[PDB]
Each structure stands twice: as structure tokens, then as C-alpha cells.
Design a protein around this nucleic acid. Sequence first.
RNA 1: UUAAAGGAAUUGACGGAAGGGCACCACCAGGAGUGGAGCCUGCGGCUUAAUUUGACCAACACGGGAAACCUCACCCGGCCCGGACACGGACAGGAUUGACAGAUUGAUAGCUCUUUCUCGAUUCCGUGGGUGGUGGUGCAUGGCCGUUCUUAGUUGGUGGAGCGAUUUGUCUGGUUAAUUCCGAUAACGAACGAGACUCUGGCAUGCUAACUAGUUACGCGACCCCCGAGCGGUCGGCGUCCCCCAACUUCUUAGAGGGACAAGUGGCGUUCAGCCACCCGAGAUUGAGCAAUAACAGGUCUGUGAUGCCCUUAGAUGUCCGGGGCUGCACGCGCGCUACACUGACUGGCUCAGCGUGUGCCUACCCUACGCCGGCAGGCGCGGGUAACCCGUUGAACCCCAUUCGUGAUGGGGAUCGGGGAUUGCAAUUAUUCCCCAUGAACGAGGAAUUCCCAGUAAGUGCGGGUCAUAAGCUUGCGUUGAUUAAG
Lengths: 67, 98, 55, 170
Amino acid sequence: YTTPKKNKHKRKKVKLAVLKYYKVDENGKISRLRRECPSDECGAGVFMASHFDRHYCGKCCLTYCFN
Amino acid sequence: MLMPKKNRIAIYELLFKEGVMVAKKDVHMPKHPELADKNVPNLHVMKAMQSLKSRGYVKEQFAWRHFYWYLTNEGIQYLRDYLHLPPEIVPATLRRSR
Amino acid sequence: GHQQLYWSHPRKFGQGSRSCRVCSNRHGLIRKYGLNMCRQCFRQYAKDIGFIKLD
Amino acid sequence: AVQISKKRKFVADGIFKAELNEFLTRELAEDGYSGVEVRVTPTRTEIIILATRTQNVLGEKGRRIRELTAVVQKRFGFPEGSVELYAEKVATRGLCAIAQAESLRYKLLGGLAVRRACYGVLRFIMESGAKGCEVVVSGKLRGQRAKSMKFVDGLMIHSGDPVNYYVDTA
RNA sequence: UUAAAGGAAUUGACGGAAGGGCACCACCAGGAGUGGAGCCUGCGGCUUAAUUUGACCAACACGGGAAACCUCACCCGGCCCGGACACGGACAGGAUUGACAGAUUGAUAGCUCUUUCUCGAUUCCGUGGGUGGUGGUGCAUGGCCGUUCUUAGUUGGUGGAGCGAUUUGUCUGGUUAAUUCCGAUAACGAACGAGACUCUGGCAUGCUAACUAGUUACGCGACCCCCGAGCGGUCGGCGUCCCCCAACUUCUUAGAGGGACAAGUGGCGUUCAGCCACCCGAGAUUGAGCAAUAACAGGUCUGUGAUGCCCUUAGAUGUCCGGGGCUGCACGCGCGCUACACUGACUGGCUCAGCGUGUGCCUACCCUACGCCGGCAGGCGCGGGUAACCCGUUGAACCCCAUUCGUGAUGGGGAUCGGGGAUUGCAAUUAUUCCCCAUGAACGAGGAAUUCCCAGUAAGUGCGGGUCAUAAGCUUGCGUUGAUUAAG
Ligand SMILES: [Mg+2]
Ligand SMILES: [Mg+2]
Ligand SMILES: [Zn+2]
Ligand SMILES: [Zn+2]
């Protein structure tokens, strides 16, 4: 009837309200900033992650070497 | 429930091609036997027809361990719009056998 | 949730996986001849199956 | 594929019979149900309902047979074109016990005096050509404690085998 | 100071009140016991984080409750939403799913956290409202079930008696397992229960019928035989509906019909109901099922999408996962199992069954022949069987025959406990079960008391269904051997 240890909350997401994953110079130029996933489905589609060093494909859970 | 939009059209197209659908009261079944082609658990088959009751569209009775459902005519005119069908397509409810 | 271990304890052999085909209890059920009904209300439908008592 | 033993053949179609009896009870109770009767062939199987009000099981051009064929077909493992339903009127409405058990169900749901409702049905079976009948209505009547009022009329046997076919209970 | 105290009758219940009947859940006469011992299992108590709980003749091997986990309620922790709908908000310039790595955990639970990709109106937030619950309440109920209750009991209609409640019918007697009948009679005519009835068991050398049952005969093969034959003997070896290279139903399995009625004969009895003897005959009462009227504050909401009301509903009594518990032990009680030996235990020979059950829609896994590995449980290869087709002529135990042992807590008894070996399983620890070797405890027939039973019965003795992945000291059935006492 107490619950002292406080199960803290649920998961509320980070809510980052900006895309801007395509920087542009010289008045119009396609330029990636994140790697694409090397899977059989989403070549230059749904991005691969850019961490402080590593890459990670979020949709199908494949990951590139930590380098 | 969580409502994947491919699988709601998958259960509505079966619930509109005939005026029945025959889920069984067990939640831990990964494969509805009559659908059987979009690896649907019948969690969704329950919890879609729950909502179809509460809008007044579907009409339930419960067997030994089975859910049987029927179309009320308000549900039929709802499904001709959400499946985006012309007002000539009707189920096997009205007259396809003689 | 997280479907890997929702229903992961193996319902296989054992009385946590047998159940009544009418009435959905796991206790007392008769798995003889593939009946798989509850003990308490096999007696209801025993004439509907066709099992007469002695007369 | 391979077929199963004769001992569990006979309990499987007996439990087929008991299952759709219970569902067609739950559906057609308000419509005068009074049972079913099954015939299996190596073709289309034919199940005749024994409804007393055969008008109400028929929809506008017979809907509530055709969806009631479909739930029988899409549950009990029949292909498209193997089970059919027919509605048939059972003779002497007030002589089979299931029928007016259900009739006085919806008369007591109608809010009658329980003594008024049971007398109308007691008078009805005994004028329908019966040798004896009795109705027991038991539970929470006017009072906080439950009690049982029975309304026996005529003669009625209780023991032996002839209380298996000379009677029907409900 | 008080709403009754009282009177006469009636119906029930009761009587350490009479009279007449009945019951092995009563006794006699007996048997087997139980009660003492060890063990198995339920209950109480104690203990415990929890040792979940319901029930106290008619609770206590009972919830078909033999729990490793699941079951599962209870305990310690942790995810999930499987919170439908209705309204508003959030809401394309950023509502919501999912997730690699790592401190983060019991956990490869994105549980949370750090970082960052991904999902396409699906949702999320708030408020009403559902919904679920092995949550309460069986004294709010239904249904089922047990019980007074295995005994003969119960009720109208119409007449009669009473102002009336009621009573007669429904009885002096005789008789019956029975208000069963006879008869008597202010009653008459009835109905339910009893009985009949259904299942079962025993008999029909009669009928119908059998390559999924058989017999007999006839062929063939084998083997024995004074001496050496064979219409000799043995053979569950083969064949004879395989397209006649035979007939038949005794045995086996059914189906029909028959048969027993107290019929026949004495004796008793009102020559009534009936009873007691015999003869004939398979049988002169087979065994069980259903089972009334009226009830119980009987049990069950923890069997049920039977259900009222209350409670709880997201830090949820919902549900899932992991661990633990329901098995903890100074003790008390109840069912039972094995024993205390020589009417026995060994070791080996030898011969007899019946009831039944078997591969699954979800559901994974069934019964087992044979062959070959193993000292044993077992392991493989190889078949058959959805069954009068295969296991299976179910070579069951007891018993029978020989051997050893000799009245010694002994080769009786096998508890306890060490070490090893296999199988089931996701997992065997608090030993699942089985196997082997060793250890070798009480126990010498059981006080008061108490149970069940009178014929294939008691008791002995195994077998099979239920539970069952692994499993019966339980239960429900089956056969086997078979009585001692009694007809009150
Ligand atoms: Mg229940
Ligand atoms: Mg001795
Ligand atoms: Zn891809
Ligand atoms: Zn409560």
C-alpha cells in the first residue's frame, strides 16, 4: 500500500522539431550528411544513423562497425 | 489497439465480402485461420470489432469460445466509404444466392 | 510487450495448456476420446453428445 | 488426409451437434427456437431448424439464414458449398417444452406478475392436448429471500425409463 | 410495572410413554480389520516474505487438488494495455510506434538512461464512460449436487363431520420388500412414489449369419514310434472365396424370438391375501439405474460469456515474465500402503484371465511387435495398427512343483541414507520417476474404542481406464482364488 521505490514515469520521446539533414551551398546542391542504409530496400532512402563514430540502420536493425 | 493500416483493410475486406467474421476468444494466436496471409494475430481481429460494436456497426454473439459477428446496415454504408467503394458493391448479405 | 518474451513460457505439455473447448477452465478437464470439455459441464451436454446413462 | 478412430468419430459429431445447438439457442431464442436436426452426407450437409416463428428467421429475402449458414460454415470447417440451413415449423407449439420456456422468458422480461405469466402458459399446454405439465419458477420473487413457486397441473410420472420420451424438460 | 397472562381444541416436532413393524450406514453370531509400528496422503496447530484457499452423520486420498515451471489465487520483483467508444486538446513550420551500442537489469524487458535513426494518423493527453477480475458476498441468487431420505410416503376432486384450524378418504385386523394387497368401511373415484419399466447376469447343440470369429474334416510339411508300421500320436506349421484346389456354427460375436408365472404338488391360512416345503428346471429374490410431496439459510459466485450488488481499474486485485511458496515441523487427528514370518521368504521350474485403451483440427507428444547393442533401467534400426485386421492365443499375480532357510528382530521387515547409472523435460536443487551396489530402523498381531460385510459375498491377488511430457500407496472398473458365521 506504499510503493516507496517510485517506478518514475513512462517513455516520453525527445521531440526534436527540425529535419535539416541536407545542407546546401552554391544556390541549390544535393548533399547528404548522414549515411544511407546498405540494406536491400532503402538505398539512399531511410537514413543510417550518425553517432559520434558509428553507423546504425534503424529500420532493419543492422549496424556498421564502431569506427 | 495499435491498428496497422494494411491489416485493418485486410480485415475489413473480409468483413465486407461476407456479412460475418468468426474470430475465436484466444488472444495468444498469431495467425487468424481465414486470413492466414498477412501474419495477422487475432488480437487485432478482436480489437477492431470491439470498435465496430461501439459505433453501432457490428453485432456480436458469443459461442462456446468463438466470437460471431454480423453486419447492421449502418455498418455496411460505413464500409462502402472507408473501403472507398462505389454504391453498387454489396456483401453476400443481400442477394448473391437465389 | 516486446514480443520476444510476452508469451514465452512454453505452453506445451502440462495442464497450463490444456483447456476446456466449451467453457475455458484448465481444471478437471476430460481429455479422453478428444472430448476436452470441463468436468463440471460435461454433464450438461452429455445427452447432446449421446451418452445415455444406464437408462 | 488420414482419418481418425471410430470411437472419436462419434464423439466429434456429437460435439459438433452440441455446439451449434448452443449457438442457435443464443441467436434464435427470441424467435422461438425449439432445437435442430442434422444429416451428414458425402456432399452438402443439411441442417433443419425447428423454429416456431419461421417468419423471423427469414430476413428480407432471407438474410438471417444466409449469414447463419456462413457462421456455421466458417467455424465448423466446411468448404464453400457443403452446409445448408432450412427453417421448418414444429407441430404443436405448446407441446414441446423448449418453446414456451423461451416464451415465458420474454413474458417475464415484459414485466408481468409471475403468477399471471405462468398461468397463461399452464392453461396453454393443457389446452394444446397434453396429458400433464408443470412449471417451476424459482428465484428472487417479491422478497429479499428467494423462493420457488411451482404450478403443477394434471398428472406426471417421475421414475423409470418412460420419463425419457413421454417427457421433455426445459 | 407490563401487552399480554390465560381457556378449549387442531397440526407438527419431541418423550429416560405404550403397542406393531424394519435396517449389517443397527445389534447378535462371525470374519477381515482399523486403533499400536514405519511410510504415503488430507486436516488442525506451530513456524514463515508467503506457507493462497473452500469444506468441521451429511468436512479430513474431498474441490475428480498425483503443484518441479505453467496451472495459481499467495509472497518478492519487473514489462505490458489486451483503457472500447463520446467530446475537447495535441495536432504537417514536427501528434505517435519501433530500435544497435554501452554504466542500466535477475533478464539480449529500448524497463529506464546517454546518443540517434526509424514508424505514417495508427496514436497520444484530458474528461465522461466501458471493460476485465480464481476480487468479496452461496444468508442476494440461478443451475447442478448432497442430505432428513432407501424408508413407504404424498395429494386433489366430490360427498360426510366440525363455527373454525382441520378431519374422513389415507382403516379393526390378516398379509407384503412396499398404504403391498385381501377384507372392512361416510365414503367414492383418482393421481404421484412403490411396482412395472431400461441396462445387466445366467439358459436355449433351436433361428439368422460370419477371409476382421472359429471349429471339424481333408490335403501338404515336420517329428516320434516295441520294430518299422500307419485312418497311430503331437503341431496357434501351411492350405481348402482367392475366385470353390471343403463343409458347418458347438465353441466366439450379436440380433430376433423363447423361457419363470409362485406355474405344479403337498402343508398352513378366514381355505382370503399369501406363506413354508419339495419335484421339474439354467434360474424358484441376479445386480444396478432412474426415483415423489415438502424442505435445508447444506455445499458451490475457485469450474461457466449463469448472475445481482459491492469493491478494484494503470504505482491496477486486469495480464505477462522470472524467482519463491502451496512439500516448511516439539505435536494432535482421519483415509490408506507394507509388515510382524515356516499356512513363510528365497532361487528355479510350471501353467490359467477379463474389462478395456491406443497417432491429436488448435495439440507438440499414441499402443507396441521384431532385430541388434547393454548386467539393469534403457538406446537404436526396422515394421504394424485410426483397430474382433496390429500390439494380443494380452504366456497377469496369487496358486501348483522342486530347492535353500530353520524360530534367532533371522535369508522376517525394508524405513533411513551414501555413491553411481539412465529417461521425461525449457529446467529435476527442497532428492520427478526408474536402475544398480551398500546401509538394515521400528515392528513379536496391537488398550479404550470403532468400521464394513451374509455368496462367487468378505478377504487374498494382480490387470486396465482416470489424472499422464514425465508418473499411482488414490480413485473408478475388471477378472482370479474363494470362505468360517447367519435366514434372527
Ligand atoms: Mg464458475
Ligand atoms: Mg517362524
Ligand atoms: Zn533497408
Ligand atoms: Zn472484497
